[PDB]
C-alpha cells in the first residue's frame, strides 16, 4: 500500500497583466490535477475524466458559487494584506489545504498561506493555532484566533470531511491511481573526461513517481548525482542517479518502486 | 445532507430544565446549529458544535455526538422569556445548511 | 452596523400581482439568503448569492427571482402573486458559506383571489 493525498492550492494576483486570470484553484489527488475554477471562466471543472463521469452537474454547480464566493473573499484578503505592508503593484497570495491517507489508516491534514510565494500563516490544527512569520502576519492570526467555531470548523474539515472526499476521489480514480507501471532501469557507462568513467543508472516508465535510486560498493557510495524524477508527457515518469569511478570496488544500482527492490550489478 | 428531526413541541415549568434532542443523517458534516426564534422574530443565532461534546454559555448547552448523530440544546433556570421556537441546522459536504421543522418551547409560570 | 434590513414586515397581494421585497446589510457578508417559514416545516431556501455578481437557486425556486449586482442588496422578486406563496419570508446574511446567519425581521405575505 501507499500513501494517497488531496490538496487544494488557490493563486490570487492583485493587477493581473491582461490574461493572468485573478484568481485560479486547482484540486491535486497525488500528482494529477483532478479540478479546476479561474475568475476568467467563473466556472469549477473536471481535469480528469474519471471525476467527469463520477460527479453529475450539481456537484459542478454547488462548487462553481462556493469558488465565486472563495475568489470575491481571495481578492479582499490580499487587498488588506497589501494595505497592512503598504504596498503597491502587484502581490501573490496562495493558499494550500489538504489530508493525506498512509498505509496504516493514520491521516495528515495541512492548510497554510504564502504572500509573495514565502511562508506567511501555517495552521496547526492540533493546538488549534497559526505560526505568524512577521508582525502584519501575527496581526491576522489574532483576529482568526478569536473565532474558536471557525478554528473547530477548518479541524474538522481537514480531519473528517478532506479525508471522506479523498476516499470517494480514490475510489472514482482507482484505475488512475492505485496502478503500478514498474520502472524500466538500464546502467550507462560514459567517460565524462579522459581517463574518467561515471556510471549512469536510468528509469523511465513508472508510475506512481516516487522511487528510490542509490549506487552501493560491493555500503552506500558518497557523492552520488541525481536527477530529478520528471514526467514524461504519458502519464509515467524518468530519472537518474550517477557515481564517477576512480581508477577496484563493484558497483551497483538498486532501484524500489511500489514495493519491488531491483539490483543491477555492473561487471 | 438527509434528515434531521426536532420534537414539535416542548412544555417545562418556570426556575426548572429542558434538553431538546436534534437528531440529522448525513454522509458529510460541517457543523451543527440552533438558532433561537421569539414568536413573530427573526431566528438568532445560539450556538455551533462540530467535533464531539458539550459547549455552554450561561443557562445555555449544546452537546453534539457525531458518531450518534445527536445533538441537544439544554436550557437551565428556565424563564418566560426561554418561550421561543428552537431550530436545529445543519450544514452537509456542500455547505446545505438543513433546517429542522423547529420546537416550540412552552414556559409554564 | 443595522444587521439585515427587510422591508416591508406586511404585504397583502391579489393573485397575479408581482411584488419586490427588498434586503440590504451593511456588515460586507458574502453570503445573503432568502428563506420561506410555514407551519410544520423547517426554513426552506427559494435563492441564495455567494457573492456580489452570482446567485443560484434554491430547494423552491419557482415562481420567484433574485439579483445580486451589489454585496448590500438582495432583492426577491415574486413573478405573479399565487395563494401557495402565502407565507412568512426571511432575508438572511452570513460572513461564509459555514458561518452563522443574521436574519431581517421577516415578511408576512398574504395572497388572495
Known amino acids: 500500500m501507499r500513501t494517497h493525498s488531496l490538496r487544494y492550492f488557490r493563486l490570487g494576483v492583485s493587477d493581473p497583466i491582461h490574461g493572468v486570470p485573478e484568481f485560479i484553484s486547482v484540486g491535486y489527488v497525488d500528482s494529477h490535477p483532478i479540478t479546476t475554477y479561474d475568475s476568467v471562466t467563473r466556472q469549477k471543472e473536471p481535469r480528469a475524466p474519471w471525476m467527469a463521469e463520477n460527479l453529475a452537474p450539481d456537484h459542478w454547480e454547488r462548487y462553481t458559487q462556493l469558488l465565486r464566493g472563495w475568489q470575491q473573499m481571495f481578492k479582499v484578503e490580499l487587498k488588506r494584506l497589501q494595505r497592512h505592508y503598504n504596498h503597491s503593484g502587484s502581490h501573490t497570495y496562495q493558499r494550500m489545504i489538504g489530508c493525506e491517507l498512509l498505509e496504516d489508516g493514520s491521516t495528515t491534514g495541512f492548510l497554510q498561506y504564502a504572500y509573495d510565494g514565502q511562508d506567511f500563516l501555517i495552521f496547526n490544527k492540533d493546538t488549534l493555532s497559526w505560526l505568524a512569520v512577521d508582525n502584519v502576519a501575527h496581526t491576522i492570526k489574532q483576529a482568526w484566533e478569536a473565532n474558536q467555531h471557525e478554528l473547530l470548523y477548518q479541524k474538522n474539515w481537514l480531519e473528517e470531511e478532506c479525508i471522506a472526499w479523498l476516499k470517494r476521489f480514490l475510489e472514482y480514480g482507482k484505475d488512475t491511481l492505485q496502478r503500478t507501471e514498474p520502472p524500466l532501469v538500464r546502467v550507462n557507462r560514459k567517460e565524462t573526461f579522459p581517463g574518467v568513467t561515471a556510471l549512469f543508472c536510468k528509469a523511465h516508465g513508472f508510475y506512481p513517481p516516487e522511487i528510490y535510486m542509490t549506487w552501493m560498493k560491493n555500503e552506500i557510495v558518497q557523492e552520488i548525482d541525481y536527477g530529478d524524477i520528471l514526467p514524461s508527457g504519458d502519464g509515467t515518469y524518468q530519472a537518474w542517479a550517477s557515481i564517477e569511478l576512480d581508477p577496484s570496488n563493484l558497483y551497483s544500482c538498486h532501484v524500489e518502486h511500489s514495493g519491488v527492490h531491483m539490483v543491477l550489478q555492473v561487471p | 445532507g438527509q434528515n434531521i428531526d426536532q420534537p414539535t413541541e416542548m412544555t417545562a415549568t418556570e426556575g426548572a430544565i429542558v434538553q431538546i434532542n436534534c437528531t440529522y443523517q448525513?454522509?458529510?458534516?460541517?457543523?451543527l446549529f440552533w438558532y433561537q426564534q421569539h414568536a413573530g422574530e427573526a431566528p438568532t443565532f445560539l450556538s455551533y458544535?462540530?467535533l464531539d461534546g458539550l459547549e455552554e454559555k450561561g443557562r445555555f448547552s449544546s452537546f453534539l455526538s457525531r458518531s450518534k448523530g445527536y445533538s441537544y440544546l439544554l436550557l437551565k433556570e428556565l424563564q418566560m422569556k426561554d418561550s421561543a421556537s428552537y431550530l436545529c441546522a445543519f450544514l452537509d459536504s456542500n455547505y446545505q445548511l438543513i433546517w429542522g421543522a423547529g420546537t416550540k418551547l412552552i414556559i409554564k409560570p | 452596523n443595522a444587521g439585515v434590513t427587510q422591508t416591508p414586515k406586511f404585504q397583502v397581494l391579489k393573485t397575479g400581482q408581482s411584488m419586490t421585497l427588498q434586503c440590504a446589510q451593511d456588515?460586507?457578508?458574502?453570503?445573503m439568503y432568502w428563506y420561506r417559514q410555514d407551519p410544520g416545516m423547517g426554513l426552506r431556501l427559494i435563492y441564495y448569492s455567494a457573492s456580489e455578481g452570482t446567485t443560484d437557486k434554491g430547494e423552491v425556486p419557482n415562481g420567484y427571482n433574485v439579483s445580486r449586482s451589489t454585496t448590500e442588496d438582495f432583492p426577491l422578486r415574486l413573478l405573479s402573486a399565487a395563494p401557495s406563496q402565502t407565507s412568512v419570508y426571511f432575508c438572511?446574511?452570513?460572513?461564509?458559506?459555514?458561518?452563522?446567519?443574521?436574519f431581517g425581521n421577516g415578511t408576512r405575505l398574504t395572497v388572495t383571489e
Open positions: 438572511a446574511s452570513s460572513n461564509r458559506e459555514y458561518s452563522p446567519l443574521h
Open positions: 458544535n462540530v
Open positions: 456588515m460586507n457578508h458574502n453570503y
Open positions: 448525513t454522509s458529510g458534516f460541517n457543523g
